[PDB]
Design a protein around this ligand. Structure first.
Ligand SMILES: [Zn+2]
Ligand SMILES: [Zn+2]
Ligand SMILES: [Zn+2]
Lengths: 1117, 115, 76, 47, 66, 55, 71
RNA sequence: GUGUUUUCCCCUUGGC
């Protein structure tokens, strides 16, 4: 039977089953698995055989991939500790057939030739950890909670950020103001996984007889008029043309609109002069007319509209597709159809770790084919039978991927500055919600420093796809984005089964159409190829849907959109379409009935699963372009009940509305009670809250790790943070917060902490810093070795105490170390220079563990990590889940903090003024329900949109435990014991401690190290630099009229220097002050010299001018 | 890292005086007692015991900075009464109070037992 | 100077019992890097006493210390 | 006469690794091993 | 990670109650009756046991030796 | 070799309450006791010696 | 020589020994080596699961039973 | 009695 409300339980048995079936990083794992299983083989398979004096044919087959192996299987933790690249060899079967004179060919098959190591993403179908149990993962020193979805490159966890892009194969009509074009029908085309990049087309209309439609074909410098292009496709007649562009001549308006483009072309009728026209606009036009035709013939065959087809499909199928590009342009010009929004997310695709890597493999492969080609040329063509096994420079793949996954430069190192950048970022291990969100992170390539707001705005179409709250508030604000919990990025599937199915059901294929049929007939668009038309689109939509609901012919990821107003059915199967599941609605009942809930409650015990909800036509993956056409209830009991009907025609229902939130936003309790920027600030700070970031942290040699001593589970949680696994790896402590002004040391966004709570371990954390150093053969006479230096032999040697480390040249675990203490003693022979590594200045920790090993080079390599207990202090930045943030402003012992009737003193007192301007009422409701939860003795629900919870209901509960129903309490002043006249709002709230500790920020200089080029202070704390007295400070001191303090800051306290200058010229003289003799070469004067107090950077500027042949002759006159 | 050690709240440094009377100049018969390494525990009971003295025209205590472990107690009396002896009697009688309270508590303990 | 780089115990005053290493020392005061806190204090050198950290014996090969009940051949 | 004892990362067996030596556990051959704790005086306040 | 020895807010020893807490939950005491039966009255002590995540049981899955 | 680092162990030992119902009024503050190390007149020594030689 | 008389699979890295046995089973097209590998792998799996439960035997068992009954 | 030294560019992330 149907779910009779009581539906919240059912609603989270769904979702729970989803996250059982599809852990949070499924979009990375599936993308990679699909790349390795299909796209890699596709690329090597579809690369042509190589051939050339006789000539061979060289051809590749059945590409194979082993498990990751060190040469024996490397575990990922070993690759991480030894700084290896976690990777598996890629092998392919190569058939060589050389053939020559006398008809003597030998097809010798080189089996399983090693092409290179391909880096494996962790927990993929090809990682050693795949399906591996928690026991075994712990035995591997792996974390069973670790998601996977990242690579190990030379020991660094590297995530591939999903890169957003315009959807290929799809026409878009834009108006580009500030141009000669009124409208532009863009298309970006790819047929399939082509080594050729996407080719872009535009069919623009000049705005200005007026209204001339042009086309900007690729590899054409000019802009051929479209009618010439259709004639180049061989359509002589003005009625064979337009039959592609105006599907009913009965419309006079498009007819009279297109006329002036024909008047631009009527000088050309035959295809051959049309090709001469296009060839003469070629970017490399051939001298002879015939070569110009052949060039232009190729461009149309192979470069224009490639997705529609190549060769035989040229003169019809993509003539129709170009006709459709024109038709939709004309619709956008008549205004019959609105312009496409470039930022509508149905118009976008996401390049996950699959396409991101397939692009490189098409770039690193083919390079290998060029390499073996040149090799076999050099040899074979000299009658020297080559060996291909020497021809294969396996370095090309292995280092190409290694490099790009390391730097993130998505292109050749030869041309990296021309490539994309930061596609591949070091996984954020700071806290588990940061790891999980870094893995689910999307990125718009749109330029930052691009001033446009519209690509940064939260578009309506990100609903349920992308977190409305989790964005960097920096310059990347709105460009970097995050997946929503149930958002799934479609991995891609072959359209051929769908095309075969559409060949049934009375579909009419595009090349058999009589064009008059197109007028009153829906046009079908598989992956943006127009492939036919259909008389009856009410049957197709119901059948294609039924088949999705049966998982058989159409895989769940396929999205069929039915545009009613324009008669178009567009079916997308390709990869990178972000989608999300929705409950199906039929009539007005859900298909999700009590049967499914009961079966799914006993899941595992019956091995039911989310996949059975999908394969029972109960839930459906909808994607943002199909979301255009769903009518989407938001809960059944709200929206489908017999109120005075809103629509009563819902097709789908939200599974739970909180699933619009992402990973860090769905840890916020009551986010619907906060001002939205504050939910964004929490989504930020939640990636900085110290916690336990992973349970194998004792094995990690991470460079920076913060581990909280006593991280706690939140007393109020969203349900969503069940699946985030936040109650297993929590980041924060539920503290008895009081919102009182008290002594005023909490005033402007600051907190008073309880010193006695800190003494008990409140938010006490540990800071691990790992220092890595290895060995090397620098040269013949130069060699590094781990060795205690000794003043006798080691010539260079710091003022440090080298005896803290033992004769191995390695500090031992358990030794107290401080800044500029020696950590790895290292000598390099000249006798020996000191080359050792010292603890970062003012770090002051204890050596936690020391590991020693061999790197790829087989050199001794050690990583030392030093721990540093960070007892919270004044200036440490605390925050709460509601974007309240503040430094500890003072710490009062328990005796000094205010206290209730019982001796409950707050742990954190935050100033009331944090609340009223920010309206983080979710913070107040968290505190109230946390106080209920702590008395009630179980964890409150703060799932946002849960109308079962409200403040009055909580207050009612709180009053039952003998507290004021609004959470206020009478406090007594800790100093005098008098009751405070205002009762104070006090209760448990989940606070976070952020990585921003003050001792990592405090910095001072008084004549420290100096830059070598311009003798100014070095930059930055780590360098012991001096603060920049910038331009704006210069201006602020001019306004002060503080010329003496301006001179000292911009000179005497920065780069005090002196020059001698000639009196007769103003070129700097030569001044041997050591003998007090002076001359200017060029005047030969020795008396006419005067000293000039002169900023060194000024001296250097004037010498950089003289080196341009400019004499800035400084004169004392 | 540049943290005070916790004993600095109660241990005198070599040369620090506990208490350091200073004649106030603004009004007659007023002193400022500056107690080092004391806080509201010792300063508030003295302040409130001084207000029970009818010959004390003004009595108060402050902690100039909470990060510093030093209180100032300003006492003004009537000209027939130095605040030195106001402060002395405010401690003598407050000790008599706490000692009487201690004796009465000790007896009340063993009187709750079997009573 | 003669007492720099050695492990010392503070035997007097407020830091009694703290263990640290002398990072520096004049004749009047050492600077002691405290083992527990993330801090280096300056302390009057008479307050310090050297503890040292050494191992006796130095002969690992054959300290049999007799033995471990040698089994006989004619006992089996 | 201190041979610089190391602890095999896999076996947890102790290994003697003097200078000019390859890092391998003589039990497993495993290539990662960790230094044993110091012998100096480790004293904490329990603060 | 492990149970805090003292309730941060007040001071009551809660570091000897975690295994007792879990044993009472295994007697199927309701979650607040376990706390009422251990003797935690103040919500500041109760949030020590309710909120505590005992990660040391996961850290002990990893082997140093055997 | 527990999974907790030494400062964590030491911290936890700090917070363990001790039955000093009487002896606290006898003992000196160590800062005030005149002896070079700890002595039974200004301290109580504790030992912990535990190894988990079982599953 | 050391590994000759001293067995390895009972080491803490039993998962790695199982991975090696799986690799040896997959590498072999002979059914006899595949069946010997299957038997060895099942035996090592049983032994390791027994040891895991034995170390899981106390306190770990108790918190497993409480989580499973709590849900 | 011998004692302060010593890398850069580029990218990414983060702080007000
Ligand atoms: Zn001159
Ligand atoms: Zn408490
Ligand atoms: Zn003593």
């Amino acid at each position: 039977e149907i779910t009779p409300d009581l539906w919240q339980e059912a609603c989270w048995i769904v979702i729970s089953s989803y996250f059982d079936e599809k852990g949070l990083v499924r979009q990375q794992l599936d993308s990679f698995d699909e790349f390795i299983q299909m796209s890699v083989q596709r690329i090597v398979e579809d690369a042509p055989p190589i051939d050339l004096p006789p000539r061979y044919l060289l051809k590749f087959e059945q590409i194979y991939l082993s498990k990751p192996t060190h040469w024996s299987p490397m575990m990922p933790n070993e690759a991480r500790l030894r700084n290896l690249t976690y990777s598996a060899p890629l092998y392919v079967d190569i058939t060589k057939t050389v053939i020559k004179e006398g008809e003597e060919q030998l097809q010798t098959q080189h089996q399983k030739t090693f092409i290179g190591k391909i880096p494996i993403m962790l927990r993929s179908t090809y990682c050693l950890l795949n399906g591996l149990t928690d026991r075994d993962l712990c035995e591997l020193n792996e974390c069973p909670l670790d998601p996977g979805g990242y690579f190990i490159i030379n020991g660094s966890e590297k995530v591939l950020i999903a890169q957003e892009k315009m959807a290929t194969n799809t026409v878009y009509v834009f108006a580009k103001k500030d141009s000669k074009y009124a409208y532009t029908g863009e298309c970006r085309s790819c047929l399939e996984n082509s080594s050729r990049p996407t080719s872009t087309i535009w069919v623009s209309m000049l705005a200005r007889i007026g209204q001339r439609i042009v086309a900007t074909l690729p590899y054409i410098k000019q802009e051929v008029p479209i009618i010439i292009v259709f004639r180049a496709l061989g359509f002589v007649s003005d009625r064979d043309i337009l039959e592609h562009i105006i599907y009913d001549f009965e419309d006079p308006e498009m007819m009279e609109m297109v006329k002036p483009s024909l008047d631009e072309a009527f000088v050309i009728q035959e295809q051959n002069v049309a090709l001469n026209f296009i060839g003469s606009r070629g970017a490399k036009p051939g001298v002879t007319k015939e070569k110009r035709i052949k060039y232009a013939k190729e461009v149309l065959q192979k470069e224009m509209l490639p997705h529609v087809g190549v060769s035989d499909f040229c003169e019809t199928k993509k003539a129709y597709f170009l006709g459709y590009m024109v038709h939709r342009l004309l619709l956008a010009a008549l205004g019959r159809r609105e312009l496409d929004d470039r930022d509508h997310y149905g118009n976008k695709r996401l390049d996950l770790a699959g396409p991101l890597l397939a692009f490189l493999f098409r770039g690193m492969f083919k390079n290998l084919l060029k390499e073996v080609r040149i090799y076999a040329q050099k040899f074979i063509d000299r009658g020297k039978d080559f060996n291909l096994e020497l021809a294969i420079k396996t370095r090309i793949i292995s280092d190409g991927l290694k490099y790009s996954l390391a730097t993130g430069n998505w292109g050749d190192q030869k041309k990296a500055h021309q490539a994309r950048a930061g596609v591949s970022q070091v996984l954020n291990r700071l806290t588990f919600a940061s790891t999980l969100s870094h893995l689910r992170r999307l990125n718009s390539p749109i330029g930052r420093d691009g001033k446009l707001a519209k690509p940064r705005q939260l578009h309506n179409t990100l609903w349920g796809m992308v977190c409305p709250a989790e964005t960097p508030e920096g310059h990347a604000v709105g460009l970097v984005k995050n997946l929503a919990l149930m958002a799934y990025i479609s991995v891609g599937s072959q359209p051929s089964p769908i095309l075969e199915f559409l060949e049934e059901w009375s579909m009419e294929n595009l090349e058999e159409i009589s064009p008059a049929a197109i007028a009153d007939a829906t046009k079908i668009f598989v992956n943006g190829c127009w492939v036919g038309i259909h008389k009856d689109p009410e049957q197709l939509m119901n059948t294609l849907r039924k088949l999705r609901r049966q998982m058989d012919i159409i895989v769940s990821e396929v999205s069929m959109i039915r545009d009613i107003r324009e008669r178009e059915i567009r079916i997308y199967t390709d990869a990178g379409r972000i989608c999300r599941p929705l409950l199906i609605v039929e009539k007005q009942k859900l298909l999700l009935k009590k049967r499914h809930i009961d079966q799914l409650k006993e899941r595992e015990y019956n091995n039911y699963s989310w996949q059975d909800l999908v394969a029972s036509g109960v839930v459906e993956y909808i994607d943002t372009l199909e979301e255009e056409t769903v009518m989407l209830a938001m809960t059944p009991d709200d929206l489908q009940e017999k109120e005075v009907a809103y629509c009563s025609t819902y097709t789908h229902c939200e599974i739970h509305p909180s699933m619009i939130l992402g990973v860090c936003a769905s840890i916020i309790p009551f986010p619907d009670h906060n001002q939205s920027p504050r939910n964004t600030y929490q989504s930020a700070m939640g990636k900085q809250a110290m916690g336990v970031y992973i349970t194998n942290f004792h094995v990690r040699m991470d460079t920076l790790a913060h581990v909280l001593y006593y991280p706690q589970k939140p007393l109020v949680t969203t349900r969503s943070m069940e699946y985030l696994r936040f109650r297993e790896l929590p980041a924060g402590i539920n503290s008895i917060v009081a919102i009182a002004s008290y002594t005023g040391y909490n005033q402007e966004d600051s907190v008073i902490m309880n010193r006695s709570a800190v003494d008990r371990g409140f938010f006490r954390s540990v800071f691990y810093r790992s220092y890595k150093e290895q060995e090397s053969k620098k040269g013949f006479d130069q060699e590094e070795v781990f060795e205690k230096p000794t003043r006798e032999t080691c010539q260079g040697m710091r003022h440090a105490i080298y005896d803290k480390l033992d004769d191995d040249g390695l500090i031992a675990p358990g030794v107290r170390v401080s800044g500029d203490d020696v950590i790895i003693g290292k000598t390099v022979t000249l006798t020996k220079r000191d080359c050792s590594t010292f603890l970062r200045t003012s770090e002051t920790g204890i050596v936690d563990q020391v590991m020693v090993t061999l790197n790829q080079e087989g050199y001794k390599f050690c990583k030392i990590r030093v721990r540093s207990v960070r007892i919270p202090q004044i200036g440490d930045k605390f925050a709460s889940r509601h974007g309240q943030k503040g430094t500890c402003g003072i710490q009062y012992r328990q005796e000094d903090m205010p206290f209730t009737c019982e001796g409950i003193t707050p742990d954190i007192i935050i100033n009331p003024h944090a609340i009223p301007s920010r309206m983080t009422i979710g913070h107040l409701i968290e505190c109230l329900q946390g106080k209920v939860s702590a008395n009630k003795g179980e964890i409150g629900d703060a799932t946002p949109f849960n109308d079962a919870v409200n403040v009055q209901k909580i207050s009612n509960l709180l009053s039952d435990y003998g507290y004021h129903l609004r959470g206020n309490e009478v406090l007594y002043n800790g100093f005098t014991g008098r009751k405070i006249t205002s009762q104070i709002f006090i209760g448990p709230t989940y606070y976070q401690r952020l990585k921003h500790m003050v001792d990592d920020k405090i910095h001072s200089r008084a004549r420290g190290p100096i830059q070598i080029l311009n003798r100014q202070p070095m930059e930055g704390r780590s360098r012991d630099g001096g603060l920049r007295f910038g331009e704006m400070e210069r201006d602020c001191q001019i306004a002060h009229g503080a010329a003496q303090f301006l001179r000292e800051r911009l000179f005497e306290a920065s780069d005090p220097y002196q020059v001698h200058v000639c009196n007769l010229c103003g070129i700097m003289a030569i001044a041997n002050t050591r003998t007090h003799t002076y001359e200017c070469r060029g005047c030969r004067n020795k008396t006419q010299i005067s000293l000039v107090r002169m900023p060194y950077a000024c001296k250097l500027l004037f010498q950089e001018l003289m080196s341009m042949s400019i004499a800035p002759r400084m004169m004392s006159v | 890292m540049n943290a005070p050690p916790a004993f600095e709240s109660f241990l005198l440094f070599e040369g620090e005086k506990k208490i350091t009377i200073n004649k106030d100049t603004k009004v007659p018969n007023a002193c400022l007692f500056t107690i080092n390494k004391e806080d509201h525990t010792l300063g508030n009971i003295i302040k409130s015991q001084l207000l029970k003295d009818p010959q004390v025209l003004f009595a108060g205590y402050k902690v100039p900075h909470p990060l510093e472990h030093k209180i100032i107690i300003r006492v003004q009396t009537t000209p027939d009464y130095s605040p030195q002896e106001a402060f002395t009697n405010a401690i003598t009688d407050l000790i008599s109070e706490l000692s009487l309270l201690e004796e009465r508590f000790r007896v009340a303990i063993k009187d709750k037992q079997e009573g | 100077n003669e007492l720099i780089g050695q492990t010392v115990r503070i035997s007097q005053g407020p830091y009694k019992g703290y263990i640290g290493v002398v990072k520096d020392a004049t004749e009047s005061t050492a600077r002691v890097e405290l083992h527990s806190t993330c801090q280096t204090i300056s302390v009057d050198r008479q307050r310090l006493t050297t503890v040292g950290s050494r191992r006796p014996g130095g002969m690992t090969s054959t300290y049999g210390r007799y033995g471990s009940q040698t089994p006989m051949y004619g006992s089996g | 006469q201190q041979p610089m004892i190391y602890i095999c990362g896999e076996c947890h067996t102790e290994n003697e690794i003097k200078s000019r030596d390859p890092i391998r556990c003589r039990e497993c051959g495993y290539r990662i091993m960790y230094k044993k704790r110091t012998k100096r005086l480790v004293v904490f306040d329990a603060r | 990670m492990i149970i805090p020895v003292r309730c941060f807010t007040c001071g009551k020893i809660v570091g000897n109650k975690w295994e007792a807490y879990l044993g009472l939950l295994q007697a199927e005491y309701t979650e607040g009756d376990a706390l009422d039966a251990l003797g935690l009255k103040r919500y500041c002590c109760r949030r020590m046991l309710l909120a505590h995540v005992d990660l040391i049981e996961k850290l002990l899955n990893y082997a140093p030796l055997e | 070799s527990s999974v907790l680092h030494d400062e964590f162990i030491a911290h936890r030992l700090g917070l363990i309450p001790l039955t000093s119902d009487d002896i606290v009024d006898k003992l000196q503050y160590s800062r005030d006791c005149t002896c070079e190390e700890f002595c039974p007149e200004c301290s109580v020594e504790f030992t912990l010696d535990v190894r988990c030689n079982e599953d | 020589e050391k590994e000759r008389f001293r067995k390895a699979p009972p080491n803490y890295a039993m998962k790695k020994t199982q991975l090696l046995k799986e690799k040896a089973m997959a590498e072999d097209l002979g059914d006899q080596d595949k069946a010997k590998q299957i038997q060895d792998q099942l035996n090592e799996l049983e032994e390791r699961a027994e040891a895991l439960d034995r170390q899981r035997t106390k306190n770990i068992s108790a918190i497993s039973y409480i989580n499973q009954r709590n849900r």
